[PDB]
RNA sequence: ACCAAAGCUAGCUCAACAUACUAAAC
């Protein structure tokens, strides 16, 4: 006898029917899309300008960032005055 | 509403740094042995004993040591090729000496490997040091 | 055997197919949308993060509604959104 | 040599026929049969033991636990809070150096650490990189540019005496993980964030020149490094007269991850590319 | 024109590759037809029964998925009561009616549900496999090199005559490189016979290698084995899967 | 005790036949073809099964979470008195404790 | 002790002996004295200072916590500045 | 020697895929 075809992995990018509803969420989420293009890229046909936040998440991001990441100085100044405290 | 993007090649260079290799990079050529690190490379050719006993995929001699049931101690010498009982005996003849006593041993002929009852790794990987292999 | 379209989507499916499909668009989409309801029984804090009185390390809150039931008898009235806890 | 291959001729041939374990590698299974395993099949007589309703492990038989009257002490309290470092020997540092697994004419790194397969970083188990340890401080004869999270007075006067260049920088988990493992984040389709600055309990450490501290002075650099060499007993090397004094010299930007590359950049690995934003608040968020 | 095979990977200093002979399967007496140089490491590696036997075991189990599901007393139908009262009836105590006791009662332990027999052998172990399978297949006068794996004819009874006459054995597994790359000649020739088996490079099993008694192999065959199998004695633990892009892996 | 009185038909089993000459065939995909397709990809069967193994309760458990929303309702209340049983017996009966 | 789970499937660990042990590399395991709280206008000095020392515990009771601990408190655990660093070892142990 | 004994089939079980899911008769 001979061999059946090897099994193969496709290197073609994979896209789900989004209006099927038997496509699991994960297939479906942006992420999804974002692994797609870091894995094929150019034949993925993701718009490369999306792998960056918008506006909203960008101000999002800034005030979580900004609510809690203290400065390096404003830090140091914390530090300095429980040190006086102790001291 | 999407940003613009810049597409460039030439901060490229620095993502092959970050690249691990799937192989062992084999180890440079020093002016002076053993190096630094106690690292020695062996002979360029090969000695006359009935057995070889290869190095490991690091580079270093198969020499470990073994604890079983908590007090148990062995010496498992590993990567044999040949006359295993010709190593077996000059292990013993090398042993007897420093114990006053010929050491037990088992050679496992199937897998090329003695095992010598007590902690000798030391001793071992500087005789197969001065053996060349 | 097994079901090839799990029990969850079956009302979907329904609606998706039959007499459901010929309704307006509009109407659909207002339907199938499920937005949560302002808070009524429940009172929901502020930020999505908390500092822990006794881990002093952040952890992420979150709001969970209480169930509120409303009997027939709200229907034919206005609660403003209230009901029986 | 192999006198098996040999003896193999005489032998007929190896099939699915002619297979057999090794003895002792499979312990045979017994079962409750027979007149010795049988009756009570090693349960015993009545009680609970037979029945297999005997009381779970820390039961004494209504006695108080003696896992129950020892008094609560803080032993593992905030043990998930707790900053761990991999310490990393000068003697390991030499022997990868020796066997060629990192190379000291770059600088050495964490992911090249983990690359040459000399220290294994678990972030998801707190830990917060490499510390420098001087176990083998006496046999050091390396000159690298190392960059750790932690190091010793010793160990770094051992790299001095060399001629190395010591740093302690910071690295958030994320940060820790993409530093870690790079090409599974660059899989990931994500751009390259920025590395957070280190908490108020590590910021002294991190703002020290003696401590050799990414945020610290570098004006005050080599008065701490002629401090260490007048302690210890050895010459302080010119070490801007050295010939790769630029890779001793390189230098990683406090919100920087890898070395070159930039916050906001998008590796595309498949095309061998490399994304960057041109968006000014973009860039603002990313140069921040 | 002798064609001669050289060993493409450093060999140890202390060991020298083995050489066979390398035939054709094209005419019925050229069974000399060049020489072939196969890696020690690959070929002469010490025979391991041991690991052959594991790796056998680990093919013929991990794929196994038991449809054995038997019901136990409180899957059965009916015996939701009492069938009689506890006292008084002078018979013996019962509760539900599809006890294991019982006729139509549910089973004890039986088998339950589908079971998946399912774990992996280490790959450097599945590795030595195949290298002492390899090993003792040419070792024991069974292992044959052939060139381009080319034929006259596609007659099945060709093949038959040529392994007669060749003294190959009952059962032949000829090895090729690829699958789209192999001659329709001996496709046709293979897809009528069952004991002459054709399966490309990758389709190579310690199962297979053991079920037929004579292996045959082509040069590239040879060449893409011994470079497939001699990289795992000198690689690195895998810090991801081996399928994402490395530093010298592809 | 009564043992059939005819003898049965012997059965002619060919040991070379299409799944019998190419069993196993593939084994070696991952090793022998430049890492791509793990062997997982070649067990066939039910999908709460496909590359994994575990005891009873496991499987139960894995059964219930992967296709338990499309289980029949029979089957899923057999399978939820399997999983407390299984746990019940397996978490406070034994011997070895 | 919970040795199946029945989200996971998992082995479980109970929480009393990590907040009353501390488990050392090595395999020993540390605890405090009970009573070293309770009425110390009581006890002597030299009692009190019995009760405020540290102790070992036995095979038994070692394999025990075991048994009721998992795999992650049997760890090898690198911490900054760790007091029982110097302890997580066993040094000329000759059995 | 009675009572009796032996068949190999009816069919079931567990999964995969699946039109997309209250069969036919009304
Ligand atoms: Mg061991
Ligand atoms: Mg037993
Ligand atoms: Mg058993
Ligand atoms: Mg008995
Ligand atoms: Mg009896
Ligand atoms: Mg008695
Ligand atoms: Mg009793
Ligand atoms: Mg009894
Ligand atoms: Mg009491
Ligand atoms: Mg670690
Ligand atoms: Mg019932
Ligand atoms: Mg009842
Ligand atoms: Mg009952
Ligand atoms: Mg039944």
Redesign the interface.
Known sequence: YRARPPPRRSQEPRWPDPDDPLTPRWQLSPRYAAKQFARHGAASGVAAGSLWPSQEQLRELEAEEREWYPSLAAMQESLRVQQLAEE | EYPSFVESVDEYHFVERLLPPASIPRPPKHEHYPTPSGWQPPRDPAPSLPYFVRRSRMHNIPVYRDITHGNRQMTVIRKVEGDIWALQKDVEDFLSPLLGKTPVTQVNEVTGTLRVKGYFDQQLKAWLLEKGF | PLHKVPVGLWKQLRLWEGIYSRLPRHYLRSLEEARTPTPVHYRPHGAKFKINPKNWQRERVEDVPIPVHYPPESQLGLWGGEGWV | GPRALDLLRALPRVSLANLKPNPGSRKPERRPRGRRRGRKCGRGHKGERQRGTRPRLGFEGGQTPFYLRIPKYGFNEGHSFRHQYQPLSLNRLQYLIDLGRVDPTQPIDLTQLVNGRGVTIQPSKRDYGVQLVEEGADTFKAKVNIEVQMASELAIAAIEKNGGVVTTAFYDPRSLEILCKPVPFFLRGQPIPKRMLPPEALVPYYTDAKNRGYLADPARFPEARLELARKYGYVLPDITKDELFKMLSTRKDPRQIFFGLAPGWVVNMADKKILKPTDENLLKYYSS | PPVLRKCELPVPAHRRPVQAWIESLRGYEQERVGLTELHPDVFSTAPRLDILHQVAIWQKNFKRISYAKTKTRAEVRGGGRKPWVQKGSGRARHGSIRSPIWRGGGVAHGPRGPTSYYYMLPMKVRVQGLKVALTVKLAQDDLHIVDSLELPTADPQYLIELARYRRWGDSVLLVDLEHEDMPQNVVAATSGLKTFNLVPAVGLNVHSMLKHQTLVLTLPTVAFLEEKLLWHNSRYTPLYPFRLPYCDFP | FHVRVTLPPRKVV?R???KR?????????G???????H?K??????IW?R?????????????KRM?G????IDDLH?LN???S???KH??????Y? | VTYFSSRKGKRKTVKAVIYRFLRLHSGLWLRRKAGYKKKLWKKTAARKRRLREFVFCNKTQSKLLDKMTTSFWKRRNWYADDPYQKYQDRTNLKV
Do not use: T
């Open positions: 060919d070379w036949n299409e000459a190419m069993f196993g065939v593939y084994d070696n995909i090793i022998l073809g430049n890492f791509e397709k062997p990809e070649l067990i066939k069967g039910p099964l590359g994994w193994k575990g005891n009873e309760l496991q499987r139960c458990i894995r059964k296709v929303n499309r289980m029949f057999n008195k399997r999983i049983y299984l746990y397996f978490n406070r009966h034994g011997k404790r």
